[PDB]
């Protein structure tokens, strides 16, 4: 189990970070996440493994949310190529994007830095393949690169978009439903962590060089 | 699709906005980044260090019950 | 090419394959003992049989 | 409805990328024609759009502004006890 | 870490062996050494009904853990100190483990190094 | 590299031909021909009370609605579910079983009013 | 899908309008009927570009087949309303 | 037993006194009641079967598979009214005798307690089954599918004549009940290997057991739609119903002498499931579906552990109504392109919006989707085979992926995509089509929640 | 430089990177516009029946059913009992039934042997 | 603008 | 328990709801999409109740 | 098949919507675009056509070399996301005439109307098709090409089909 998913979660990290249609960015982000779950029930931390899932819930689904509003903007059109100029264009499904990338890399205390750090944390301080655990830290890193890549070619640089298009985003319903996940988003980790009753032994002492492999590699 | 305020499309064109739509995204990015640097004054251990990591070298051999080589 | 195309596929899953067994055979992992547990190291909470009194195992501070 | 498109000769290469991309093509013997075509793209509110850096700290000032402020209250309810 | 280079590149002989250890008798230094003190007994981790995995030496203090968080419910935010306290329990277990490797380390240190003079002069 | 002389005169036939057909496609405002319907008296009352977008009214009606919800869709199914739960379920032997709550030294057995010894003494931590 | 319905005379005027900002193209001359080749000498492979030009400004290919048939701006608009279902 | 033989046989005096134009009405409705009077056979015990009298007698096996039998005669003539129409009255109440006089056969042949009374009705099937092939037919190879079907049968069903006359003679009964105690084993001699091959052939010819199987695409393929439902929905369980009757007086010989034949399914089942992904005929596609279905039914019957019996009663009664259903809906699409091609008519959806949601639940059916009576007959048939050795998984699990495929598949072909430009008689569903597929699967689905009644004498 | 296309039975060639298509000749020229006359003379064929506004049914296509024939009902009067034949038959229809049968037999041998030892695990087994 | 919808019969 | 049995039940039951009004038609249509966002919305906040009895 | 001229144009399209897909950001799009032309300008009036060949024989080797994997395609073309989404929706217009009376009496406008085309369709079919026969040659059709409407008051030949199509949003 944790060499299954250590390749995936590398391979398919691996295929998005050239990938242009905007939702199979976001689908190939998914797989290394689902990867990632598996090491961690690997390297016996069922418990982590099934935090991520809970976690991974909120901004996962929110990205897609966002990526369909831009979507439809631009009359279906899927091709990260043919967007762009958008940071000021839509403001609300900006920030939210914005918002569930910081979640996905791992930004600390969102909903994804208290189940993701965790996990990378257990990886290091344990008696695991060698192999498995670069494949997790490299994937790491390919996690930050992607997810640029969809801000970067979506939301900056100037507008590639066709010349008459609507660029709307003001029904109520699409920013309520946004704005009950972007909620979501930022405490559901926090909640969470803090609630759920203790089921382990947590390892929070070892190398600080380990502590903040994450924070370094995701940097990077 | 259908519902809510109407914009009506401009043609090469910033879009026209509305002041909810502005307001309501520019709070959001603020409360996200009043979490983080409130998060981080009251919890900085969690993501630097919780407790010192002792270096062995400097563990002198008696404490650890390493006797003299020639007994 | 249809042929190149086999070549880097296979090349890649071989190659994936012989580095997980050797680092299989060389895990990593961190420098401490064994984790203790308390009294005949839980041979009653962990399905022991009461009748066949366990070895002693004892474990000492440092 | 009838939309009313804008004038079309406020559309230059003038002072934009394009600019300085035909500068560059005329020292090669070329020219670049639909130049115009692609210049709304860098006209009007798509004129110096924010920077990768910029867009992370967006909210930065009214979140830390609000910081600021927020732990003020802490420290002087905290002088209390 | 680094004993992973020295156990992988270097001597194998005067580096611990994790699914071995401990080799060297308990007792060879410490001419008298204390048994760990266990203050929770079997009745009450198993009325509290820990994990097997939380039943070491630490029971104790996460007994009261649970203990003040249950009650301050729906106060998610109270019961910190006890899991400090727990935590930090857990911490200086960490370093007897580590203590106990490097006990290892230098042991074995000494059996290449005191065997070598009985090898060369006779 | 261009139409024929004759292939812009069949287009040009069959594409005012096309408009037609599409013109055709219109629905005059009578259409639909809705057939006569037996219409409930409740909605009335609420049809003409929400002729007007009074933002008292607005909520009047939000308020209805979502309780008649909460009390065909909440309240009725759990009566059912509890009646079926307690007097058919819960009858039966080992249906329903329920994890042994936890106990802590010093807790108080309601059942019985037995008194869990305190743990033992801890020597210091300070830290 | 929420946008505005295109209209015969927001075609012919879109199309103009692209062409208007081609260097290659007098304005005041640029009728509906101005022929791309015999009344503007330009080249085919001019017209290609043109072609090109419209299909990104309106989104949608539009074959080989048909393009090069295409040769008068009138035509592309009486192409584009037969193709997108365009009436009045 | 003769409370429903009776009542079968005053059918034909029904049809025939009946007026010019109610024949299908009278029948029909009659006919129903019949069936709903079936249900009486369910007043089996834990313990010991309904021995009515000295011929006729039914346990918890025959009764699942008489009451699918008298259900099916009233949509067998709800599927015949259309191809029927334009037909001299005369014939359409032979057409009719037909069918009410094969029940009459097939009701006798379930409940005989003697296994000679069994043979005669068990053979004497083939007269009505095979004059609905070759008189009601539509094609010119309905006559050369008769003979087939007709050949192919009796070549195995007389050598387990001898066997049978054999048996009495030395054991003085083919009483069931009786053979219940005087059973003796079956020691190991080339005698014996020509007895248990005799008794077995003549069922795994209608199972059929592949190889053996070549008849089955030509009868169900050529047969109309009321043939093919009666031939692929209970004909099939004539063969299945006799291994789990006659291997009772065969151990312990059976447990050797299945391995030419449980190889032969295990690995069948991969050569007919294979077949129907490369189909061009959509009504050739069930039929080979079917021999994949009963494959399974010959591997269970063959191993003899509780939950093969279990099991292999449950995929009897599962296929029956959705080899049918499918039938059924196969030819609905027949009589308005009068094409048996699967690729003539395409992108029905959109035309059809309702007959594709039947299609949805008979292809969901057919692929055995939990919890339907398809997967809990087809589950109990796997978990025992591993009981028998752990690499059968390999063979059933991979069985079921191509399953998934050839349903799924005409699935797809048929009812998405682009219409048939061509095609513009696709008229409206008529309510009799639609009453006629809420019959074959409401039934089906309800058994879901007391599925207790068709898993046999085992349960 | 630029390194030659090599196609395969799952990957066509390139109609770009075809020779035969740049070589040009008279008879070439002929063919495609022969072709054409065919592909042309369909086309009326179906266009006056489809187009018929008294036409109500399907308009049967012996392409089609020249296809399904040849699928089913002319294979075997084709079929004739050589080599190349009876060898694929042999092991595409003997071969994977002989081997499936040193399997299971030999499993169920050694299993068999083993519960006759008592050495066989089946101690919470009362199902089969 | 209130366009017709060719749809199949649903009254069956 | 009998509040954490019965609330844990109904949640499931609720999300089934406009699956069997959807059976015999007893709604009015047009508003079904609404429907089934308020089904969902007060399936929610019915297993917040047992998880709070687990948190508790 | 295609002429020379025409393959040329052809080859000089694709290079242009490759080079999109990989220069992305217009301004680049733009410099490479105009180099690219001026790579076609200067054998615009190549003489001999062995030697014309050759370049165009060329330059497809080059294309397939550096074409972009992933080449950006419009969402409705062949290969698009949208492409082929609506065809669930295209309902033939034969359909109608399956309608309950109870259902066209809710339109009786669009029907009586559509009555209109369909005798329309009715009475100038036996002229369409003489008109067929006579300007055919006598073997058969060579090309797939449809004369117009030669006599005033005469439609197209086969004209109902493709007048009317279903919309391409029908719904
Ligand atoms: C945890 C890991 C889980 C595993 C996941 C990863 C598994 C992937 C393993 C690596 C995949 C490598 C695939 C290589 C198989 C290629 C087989 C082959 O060569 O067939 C291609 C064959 C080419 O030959 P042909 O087209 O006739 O002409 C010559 C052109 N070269 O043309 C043909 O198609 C003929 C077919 C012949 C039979 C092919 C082999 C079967
Ligand atoms: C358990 C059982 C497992 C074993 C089952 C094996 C399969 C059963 C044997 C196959 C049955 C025959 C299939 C049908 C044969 C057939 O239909 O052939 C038709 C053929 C056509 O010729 P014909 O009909 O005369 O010309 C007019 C046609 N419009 O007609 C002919 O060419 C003449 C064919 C005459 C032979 C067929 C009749 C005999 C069939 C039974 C075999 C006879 C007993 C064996 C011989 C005894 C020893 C001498
Ligand atoms: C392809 C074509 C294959 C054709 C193969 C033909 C097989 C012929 C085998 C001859 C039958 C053997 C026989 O004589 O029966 C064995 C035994 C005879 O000895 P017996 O006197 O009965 O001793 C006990 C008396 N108390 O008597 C008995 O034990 C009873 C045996 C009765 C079995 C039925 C009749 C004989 C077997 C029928 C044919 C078996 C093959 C079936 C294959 C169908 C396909
Ligand atoms: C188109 C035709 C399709 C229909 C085919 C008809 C069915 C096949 C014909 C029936 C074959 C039956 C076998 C009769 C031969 C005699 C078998 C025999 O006597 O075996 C006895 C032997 C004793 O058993 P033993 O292993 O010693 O353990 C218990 C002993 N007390 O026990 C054994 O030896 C083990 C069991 C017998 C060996 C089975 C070998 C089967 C090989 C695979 C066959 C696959 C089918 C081939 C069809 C091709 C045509
Ligand atoms: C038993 C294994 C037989 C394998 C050897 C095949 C026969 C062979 O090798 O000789 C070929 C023989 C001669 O053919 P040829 O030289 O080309 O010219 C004359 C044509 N009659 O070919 C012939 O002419 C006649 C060959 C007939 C062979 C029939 C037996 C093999 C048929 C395949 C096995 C049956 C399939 C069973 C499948 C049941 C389960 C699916
Ligand atoms: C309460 C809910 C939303 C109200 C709101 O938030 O404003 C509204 C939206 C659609 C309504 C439902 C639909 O109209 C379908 C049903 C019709 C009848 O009112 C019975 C209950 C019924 C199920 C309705 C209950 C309630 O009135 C609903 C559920
Ligand atoms: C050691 O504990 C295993 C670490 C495996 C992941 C690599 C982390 C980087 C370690 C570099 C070695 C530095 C030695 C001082
Ligand atoms: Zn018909």
């Given at each position: 189990?944790?060499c299954?998913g ?13 990938q ?25 931390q069922?418990?982590?493994a099934?935090?991520?899932?809970c ?9 897609f949310?966002?990526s369909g509003?831009?979507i ?5 059109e899927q ?12 403001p609300?499904?900006t920030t ?7 979640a ?5 205390f ?5 189940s993701?750090?965790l ?18 830290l490299?994937a790491?890193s ?5 997810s ?5 070619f979506?939301?900056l640089?100037?507008?590639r978009?066709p010349?008459?298009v609507?660029?709307?985003?003001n029904?109520?319903?699409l920013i309520?439903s ?12 926090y ?16 190398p ?7 924070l370094?590699?995701?940097i990077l | ?10 043609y ?6 509305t002041?909810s ?5 520019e709070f ?9 640097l ?5 919890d ?7 407790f ?8 002198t ?6 006797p003299?080589d020639?007994? | 090419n249809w ?8 090349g ?6 012989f580095?997980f ?8 992992y ?5 984790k203790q547990?308390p009294y005949?190291?839980?041979?009653l909470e962990?399905?022991?049989?009461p009748?066949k ?6 474990h000492?501070?440092? | 409805?009838?939309?009313?498109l804008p004038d079309?000769?406020?559309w230059?290469?003038e002072?934009?990328?394009?600019e300085?991309?035909?500068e560059?093509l005329?020292?090669?013997g070329?020219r670049?024609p639909?130049?115009?075509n692609?210049a ?25 502004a609000?910081?600021?402020?927020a732990?003020?209250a802490?420290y002087?309810?905290?002088?209390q006890? | 870490?680094?004993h992973l ?6 001597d194998?002989?005067v580096?611990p ?10 007792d ?5 050494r204390?048994?760990?003190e266990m ?5 009450e981790?198993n ?5 097997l995995?939380?039943?070491?030496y630490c ?7 649970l ?19 727990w935590?930090?329990?857990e ?10 490797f490097?006990?290892e380390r230098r042991?074995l240190?000494?059996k290449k190094?005191?065997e070598?003079?009985?090898a060369?002069?006779? | 590299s261009?139409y ?8 040009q036939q069959l ?7 599409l013109?055709d496609?219109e629905?005059?405002p009578?259409?639909?021909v ?16 929400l002729?007007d977008?009074a933002?008292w009214?607005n909520?009047?009606?939000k308020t209805?609605?979502?309780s008649?919800?909460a009390?065909?869709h909440?309240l009725?199914?759990?009566w059912?579910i ?7 379920v819960?009858?039966?032997?080992y249906?329903?079983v329920?994890?042994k ?25 300070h830290? | ?6 209209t015969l ?8 309008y692209?062409?208007?900002?081609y ?6 001359k640029?009728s509906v ?10 080249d ?14 309106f ?11 295409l040769?008068?701006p009138?035509?592309?608009?009486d192409y584009?309303?037969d193709?997108?279902?365009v009436?009045? | 037993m ?7 046989i005053?059918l034909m ?15 029909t409705?009659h006919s129903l ?6 249900l009486?056979?369910?007043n ?8 009515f009298?000295?011929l ?9 598979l ?6 099916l005669?009233?949509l067998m003539?709800?599927a015949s009214?259309?191809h029927?129409?334009?037909?001299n009255?005369?014939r ?28 005669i009705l068990?053979?004497?099937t ?8 070759t008189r009601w ?10 003979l087939?079907f ?6 195995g069903?007389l050598p387990?004549?001898?066997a049978?006359?054999?048996?009495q003679?030395?054991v ?7 053979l219940?105690?005087?059973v003796?084993?079956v ?18 010819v209608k199972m059929?057991l592949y190889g053996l199987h070549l008849?089955?695409?030509?009868a ?6 009321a043939?093919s ?7 099939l369980?004539?063969g299945?119903?006799?291994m ?5 007086i065969?151990?312990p ?20 499931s294979?077949?129907?992904?490369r ?8 039929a ?5 279905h009963m ?9 003899q552990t509780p ?5 292999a009663?449950a995929?009897?009664?599962?296929h029956?109504?959705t ?5 059924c809906?196969?030819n609905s ?5 009068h094409?048996?091609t699967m ?9 059809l919006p309702l007959?594709?949601?039947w ?8 692929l055995?989707l ?8 087809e ?10 050795s752990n690499?059968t998984?390999?063979?059933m699990?991979?069985?079921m992926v191509?399953?998934?495929?050839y349903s799924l598949y005409?699935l ?5 995509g ?7 008689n696709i008229?409206?569903?008529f309510?009799?089509?639609?009453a ?6 409401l039934?089906?689905?309800?058994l879901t929640?007391?599925?207790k ?7 | 430089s ?6 395969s039975?799952?990957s ?5 990177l075809?020779?035969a298509?740049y070589?040009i ?5 002929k063919?495609?516009?022969?072709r ?6 369909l ?7 489809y ?8 308009i ?6 020249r ?7 002319n ?6 009992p050589?080599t190349?034949?009876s ?6 229809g003997?071969?994977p ?10 499993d169920?041998?050694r ?8 050495k066989?695990?089946?101690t ?5 | 603008?209130?366009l ?9 | 328990?009998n ?7 109904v949640?499931?039951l609720?999300?089934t709801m406009?699956i069997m009004?959807?059976?015999?038609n007893?709604?009015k249509?047009?508003?079904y999409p609404?429907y ?7 399936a929610?906040?019915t297993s ?9 | 098949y295609?002429?020379h001229?025409?393959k040329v144009l052809?080859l ?6 490759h080079?999109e897909?990989?220069?992305?950001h ?15 300008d200067?054998?615009?009036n ?6 014309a ?8 080797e ?12 419009f ?5 698009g ?5 609506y065809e ?6 034969w359909?109608?005439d399956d309608?309950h009376?109870?259902?066209k ?7 009586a109307?559509?009555?209109?085309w369909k ?7 036996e ?19 449809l ?6 008051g ?7 089909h493709?007048?009317t199509?279903?919309?391409?949003r029908?719904?």
């Amino acid at each position: 189990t944790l060499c299954l998913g250590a390749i995936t979660t590398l391979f398919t990290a691996m295929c998005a970070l050239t990938q242009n249609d905007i939702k199979k960015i976001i689908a190939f982000s998914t797989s290394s996440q689902l990867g990632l779950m598996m090491v961690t029930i690997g390297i016996n931390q069922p418990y982590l493994a099934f935090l991520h899932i809970c976690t991974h819930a909120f901004f996962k689904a929110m990205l897609f949310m966002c990526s369909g509003s831009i979507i439809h903007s631009l009359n279906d059109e899927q091709d990260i190529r043919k967007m762009g100029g958008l940071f000021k264009a839509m403001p609300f499904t900006t920030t939210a994007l914005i918002v569930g990338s910081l979640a996905l890399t791992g930004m600390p205390f969102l909903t994804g830095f208290y189940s993701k750090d965790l996990i990378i944390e257990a990886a290091n301080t344990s008696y695991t393949n060698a192999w498995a655990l670069l494949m997790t830290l490299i994937a790491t890193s390919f996690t930050a690169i992607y997810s640029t890549r969809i801000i970067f070619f979506a939301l900056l640089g100037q507008p590639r978009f066709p010349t008459l298009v609507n660029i709307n985003e003001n029904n109520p319903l699409l920013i309520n439903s946004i704005k009950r996940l972007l909620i979501g988003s930022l405490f559901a980790g926090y909640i969470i962590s803090n609630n759920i009753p203790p089921t382990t032994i947590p390892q929070m002492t070892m190398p600080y060089y380990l502590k903040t492999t994450a924070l370094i590699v995701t940097i990077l | 699709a259908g519902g809510g305020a109407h914009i009506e499309p401009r043609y090469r064109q910033f879009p026209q906005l509305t002041r909810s739509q502005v307001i309501q995204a520019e709070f959001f990015s603020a409360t996200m980044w009043f979490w983080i640097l409130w998060r981080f004054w009251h919890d900085s251990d969690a993501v630097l260090g919780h407790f010192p990591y002792p270096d062995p070298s400097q563990w002198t051999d008696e404490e650890l019950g390493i006797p003299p080589d020639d007994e | 090419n249809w042929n190149l195309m086999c070549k880097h596929l296979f090349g890649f899953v071989a190659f994936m394959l012989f580095m997980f067994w050797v680092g299989e055979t060389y895990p990593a992992y961190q420098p401490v003992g064994p984790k203790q547990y308390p009294y005949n190291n839980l041979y009653l909470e962990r399905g022991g049989d009461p009748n066949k009194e366990p070895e002693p195992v004892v474990h000492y501070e440092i | 409805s009838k939309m009313e498109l804008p004038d079309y000769k406020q559309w230059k290469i003038e002072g934009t990328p394009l600019e300085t991309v035909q500068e560059k093509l005329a020292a090669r013997g070329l020219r670049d024609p639909w130049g115009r075509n692609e210049a709304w793209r860098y006209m009007g509110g798509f004129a110096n759009n924010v920077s990768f850096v910029g867009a992370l700290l967006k909210g930065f000032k009214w979140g830390f502004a609000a910081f600021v402020v927020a732990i003020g209250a802490e420290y002087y309810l905290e002088s209390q006890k | 870490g680094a004993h992973l280079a020295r156990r992988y590149l270097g001597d194998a002989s005067v580096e611990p062996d994790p699914l071995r250890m401990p080799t060297f008798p308990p007792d060879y230094g410490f001419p008298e050494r204390k048994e760990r003190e266990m203050v929770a007994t079997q009745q009450e981790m198993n009325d509290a009904q820990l994990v097997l995995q939380q039943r070491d030496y630490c029971a104790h203090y996460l007994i009261r853990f649970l203990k003040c968080k249950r009650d301050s419910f729906p106060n998610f935010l109270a019961c910190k100190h006890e899991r400090h306290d727990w935590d930090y329990c857990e911490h200086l277990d960490y370093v007897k483990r580590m203590k106990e490797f490097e006990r290892e380390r230098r042991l074995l240190q000494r059996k290449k190094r005191r065997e070598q003079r009985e090898a060369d002069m006779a | 590299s261009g139409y024929t002389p004759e292939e812009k005169l069949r287009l040009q036939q069959l594409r005012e031909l096309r408009r037609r057909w599409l013109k055709d496609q219109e629905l005059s405002p009578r259409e639909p021909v809705l057939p006569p319907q037996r219409v409930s008296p409740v909605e009335r009352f609420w049809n003409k009370f929400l002729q007007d977008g009074a933002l008292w009214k607005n909520v009047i009606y939000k308020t209805y609605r979502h309780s008649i919800f909460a009390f065909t869709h909440v309240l009725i199914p759990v009566w059912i579910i509890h009646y079926y739960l307690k007097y058919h379920v819960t009858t039966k032997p080992y249906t329903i079983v329920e994890k042994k709550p936890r106990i802590f030294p010093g807790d108080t057995i309601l059942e019985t009013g037995e008194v869990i010894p305190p743990m033992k003494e801890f020597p210091d931590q300070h830290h | 899908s929420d946008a505005p319905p295109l209209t015969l005379e927001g075609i012919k005027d879109r199309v103009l309008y692209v062409l208007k900002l081609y260097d290659k193209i007098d304005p005041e001359k640029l009728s509906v009927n101005s022929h791309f080749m015999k009344d503007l000498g330009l080249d085919s492979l001019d017209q290609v570009e043109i072609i090109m030009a419209m299909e990104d400004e309106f989104g949608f290919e539009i074959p080989d087949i048909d393009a090069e048939k295409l040769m008068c701006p009138q035509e592309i608009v009486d192409y584009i309303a037969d193709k997108k279902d365009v009436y009045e | 037993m003769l409370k429903y033989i009776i009542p079968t046989i005053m059918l034909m005096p029904l049809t025939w006194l009946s007026k010019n134009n109610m024949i299908w009405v009278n029948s029909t409705a009659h006919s129903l009641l019949i069936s709903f009077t079936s249900l009486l056979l369910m007043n089996q015990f834990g313990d010991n079967s309904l021995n009515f009298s000295l011929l006729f007698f039914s346990d918890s096996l025959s009764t699942p598979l008489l009451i699918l039998t008298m259900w099916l005669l009233p949509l067998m003539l709800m599927a015949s009214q259309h191809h029927l129409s334009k037909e001299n009255l005369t014939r359409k109440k032979l057409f009719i005798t037909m069918l009410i006089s094969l029940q009459l056969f097939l009701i006798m042949t379930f409940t005989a307690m003697e296994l000679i009374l069994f043979y005669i009705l068990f053979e004497a099937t083939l007269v009505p089954t095979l004059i609905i092939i070759t008189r009601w037919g539509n094609q010119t190879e309905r006559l050369n599918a008769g003979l087939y079907f007709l050949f192919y049968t009796l070549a195995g069903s007389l050598p387990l004549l001898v066997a049978l006359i054999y048996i009495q003679n030395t054991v003085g009964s083919l009483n069931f009940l009786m053979l219940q105690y005087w059973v003796q084993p079956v020691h190991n001699s080339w005698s014996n290997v020509f007895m248990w091959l005799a008794c077995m052939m003549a069922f795994m010819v209608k199972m059929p057991l592949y190889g053996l199987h070549l008849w089955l695409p030509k009868a169900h393929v050529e047969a109309p739609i009321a043939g093919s439902m009666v031939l692929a929905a209970v004909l099939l369980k004539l063969g299945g119903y006799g291994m789990l009757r006659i291997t009772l007086i065969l151990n312990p010989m059976t447990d050797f002498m299945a391995y030419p034949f449980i190889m032969l399914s295990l690995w069948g089942m991969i050569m007919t499931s294979s077949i129907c992904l490369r189909q061009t005929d959509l009504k050739s596609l069930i039929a080979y579906s079917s021999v994949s279905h009963m494959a399974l039914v010959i591997v269970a019957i063959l191993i003899q552990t509780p939950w093969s019996y279990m099991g292999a009663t449950a995929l009897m009664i599962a296929h029956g109504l959705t080899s049918s259903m499918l039938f059924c809906l196969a030819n609905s699409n027949y009589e308005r392109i009068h094409s048996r091609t699967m690729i003539l008519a395409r992108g029905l959806q959109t035309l059809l919006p309702l007959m594709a949601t039947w299609w949805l639940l008979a292809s969901l059916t057919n692929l055995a989707l939990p919890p339907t009576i398809n997967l809990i007959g087809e589950l109990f048939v796997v978990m025992s085979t591993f009981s028998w050795s752990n690499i059968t998984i390999i063979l059933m699990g991979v069985n079921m992926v191509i399953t998934a495929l050839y349903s799924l598949y005409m699935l797809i072909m048929t009812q998405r995509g682009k219409y048939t430009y061509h095609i513009n008689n696709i008229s409206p569903s008529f309510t009799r089509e639609n009453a006629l597929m809420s019959l074959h699967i409401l039934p089906l689905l309800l058994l879901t929640l007391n599925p207790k009644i068709i898993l046999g004498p085992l349960y | 430089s630029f390194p030659k296309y090599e196609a395969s039975r799952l990957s066509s060639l390139p109609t770009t990177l075809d020779p035969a298509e740049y070589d040009i000749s008279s008879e070439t020229r002929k063919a495609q516009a022969e072709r054409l006359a065919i592909r042309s003379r369909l086309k009326r064929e179906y266009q006056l029946q489809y187009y018929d506004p008294s036409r109500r049914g399907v308009i049967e296509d012996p392409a089609l059913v020249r296809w399904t024939y040849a699928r089913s009902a002319n294979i075997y009067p084709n079929f004739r009992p050589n080599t190349k034949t009876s060898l694929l038959g042999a092991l595409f229809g003997i071969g994977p039934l002989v081997f499936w049968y040193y399997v299971f037999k030999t499993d169920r041998d050694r299993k068999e042997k083993l519960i006759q030892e008592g050495k066989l695990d089946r101690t919470f087994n009362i199902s089969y | 603008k209130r366009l017709f919808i060719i749809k199949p019969s649903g009254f069956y | 328990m009998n509040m954490f049995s019965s609330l844990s039940l109904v949640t499931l039951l609720l999300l089934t709801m406009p699956i069997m009004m959807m059976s015999f038609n007893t709604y009015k249509p047009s508003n079904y999409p609404l429907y089934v966002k308020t089904a969902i919305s007060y399936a929610f906040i019915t297993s917040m109740i047992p998880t709070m009895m687990f948190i508790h | 098949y295609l002429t020379h001229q025409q393959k040329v144009l052809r080859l000089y399209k694709r290079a242009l919507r490759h080079l999109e897909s990989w220069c992305i950001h217009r301004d680049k799009y733009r410099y490479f675009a105009c180099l690219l032309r001026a790579r076609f300008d200067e054998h615009k009036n190549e003489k001999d056509m062995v030697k014309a060949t050759q370049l165009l024989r060329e330059a497809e080797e080059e294309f397939w070399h550096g074409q972009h994997p992933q080449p950006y395609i419009f969402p409705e073309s062949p290969g698009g996301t949208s492409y082929e989404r609506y065809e669930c929706y295209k309902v033939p217009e034969w359909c109608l005439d399956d309608w309950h009376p109870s259902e066209k009496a809710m339109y009786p406008d669009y029907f009586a109307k559509r009555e209109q085309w369909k005798k329309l369709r009715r009475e100038s079919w036996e002229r369409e098709v003489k008109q067929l026969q006579e300007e055919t040659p006598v073997g058969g059709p060579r090309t797939e090409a449809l004369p117009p409407a030669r006599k005033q008051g005469d439609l197209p030949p086969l004209w109902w089909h493709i007048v009317t199509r279903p919309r391409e949003r029908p719904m």
